[PDB]
């Protein structure tokens, strides 16, 4: 979940 | 009498439940970057795809053949769906939409081949068939329409005394191809590949007829 969050935040 | 069957079903149910939770939770992580491609624009997918392969690469470092095959088959199905929709709504629009879709397929295959290279570095049957049929049925029509539009600048100089019924010949050549029962965008027929090589001979016939006309009025 943390990795997915970080991913989405970086993409945003 | 039924308790052997119930312990067997209990073991099957626990194993299936555990693998289902892991599979669902990992396939759910994919969703927030796969969501744009169901209804958005054809060029957006080019920028979205790197996020999709970053996601897929991090999640296939954990849990295999069914994931690759099913995921990739449906994502490429969705790419075909979006391209086919974005073409279906003349000349510049058609050439632009075919260029965009071919570029999408090209960047998809290129970045997946880079992804496989990396996956080999640290420690595609559906793509082949479907995008190969798509790219051939797009290449044929993009080259046909580019040639037609390159010959289409002649189409309004109707006052020269030797360009009257020749353009009606070119119109018939276009029309007989564009009255045929098969759908042009579908690679499910693949019989227009003889119609294109009959069109390609009377295009050169038109070329040489116009060359003789130029040679003949001097």
């Amino acid at each position: 979940f943390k990795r997915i969050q970080d991913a989405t935040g970086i993409e945003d | 009498k039924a308790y052997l069957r119930w312990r067997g079903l209990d073991v099957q149910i626990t194993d299936a439940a555990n693998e289902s939770k892991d599979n669902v939770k990992y396939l759910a992580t994919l969703e927030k970057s796969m969501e744009p491609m169901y209804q958005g624009r054809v060029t957006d997918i080019t920028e979205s795809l790197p996020a999709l392969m970053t996601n897929v690469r991090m999640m296939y470092t954990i849990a295999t053949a069914e994931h690759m095959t099913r995921l990739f088959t449906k994502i490429t199905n969705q790419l075909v769906r979006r391209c086919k929709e974005q073409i279906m709504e003349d000349k510049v629009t058609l050439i632009g939409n075919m260029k965009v879709s071919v570029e999408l397929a090209n960047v998809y295959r290129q970045q997946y081949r880079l992804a496989k290279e990396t996956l080999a570095a640290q420690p595609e049957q559906a793509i082949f068939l479907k995008f190969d049929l798509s790219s051939k049925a797009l290449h044929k029509l993009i080259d046909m329409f580019t040639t037609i539009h390159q010959f289409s600048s002649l189409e309004q100089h109707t006052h020269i005394e030797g360009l009257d019924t020749m353009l009606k010949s070119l119109n018939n050549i276009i029309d007989d191809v564009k009255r045929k029962p098969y759908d042009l965008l579908d690679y499910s027929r693949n019989a227009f590949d003889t119609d294109f090589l009959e069109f390609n001979v009377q295009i050169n016939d038109l070329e040489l007829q116009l060359q003789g006309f130029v040679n003949a009025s001097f």
């Binding site: - | 049929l133 051939k136 027929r189 693949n190 019989a191 003889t194 040489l208």
Partner: protein, 170 residues
């Protein structure tokens, strides 16, 4: 039907010249029997004990021995317009394959372009030279083109009219 042929010749001439040089391995104008085996190896096909000797024998008809670029165009043109000539075509096929090659493993759909140029023919006639189908593609090599062409020519040659003739009924 002339326009297809004239236009095809107009473009294939430049391809043919390089095809010739590429078949040559000694950087000369002469194509020795030695080179032919090397070419087949590139295609991925193997000759028989006497195939090469027949291949060199039949093509050359203005001198004896090795072949020359002049013989090669003479062969090309005669074979191309050969259709109802019942003439040899042993070395025409290997060169036409090399010229019609641009993938360096063989060619797939381009057979149809070859076919239409020879004649409009039919989809069933295509199912004769090979088993290619309109929707499906295949992988192909040197092995599967030469053998099938050679066999087809032997199959046409055999049929002739003795008591196979059929007259309108009374």
């Amino acid at each position: 039907a002339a326009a297809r042929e004239r236009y095809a010749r107009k473009n294939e001439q430049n391809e043919l010249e390089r095809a010739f040089n590429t078949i040559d391995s000694k950087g000369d104008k002469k194509i020795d029997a030695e080179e032919l085996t090397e070419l087949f190896l590139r295609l991925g096909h193997k000759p028989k004990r006497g195939e090469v000797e027949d291949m060199i024998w039949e093509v050359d008809e203005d001198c004896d021995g090795c072949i020359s670029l002049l013989e090669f165009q003479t062969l090309y043109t005669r074979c191309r317009d050969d259709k109802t000539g019942y003439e040899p075509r042993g070395l025409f096929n290997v060169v036409e394959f090399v010229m019609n090659d641009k993938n360096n493993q063989g060619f797939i759909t381009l057979e149809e372009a070859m076919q239409i140029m020879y004649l409009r023919y039919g989809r069933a006639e295509l199912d004769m030279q090979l088993e290619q189908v309109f929707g499906t593609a295949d992988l192909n090599s040197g092995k599967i083109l030469t053998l099938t062409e050679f066999l087809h020519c032997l199959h046409t040659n055999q049929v002739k009219q003795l008591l196979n003739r059929v007259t309108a009924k009374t």
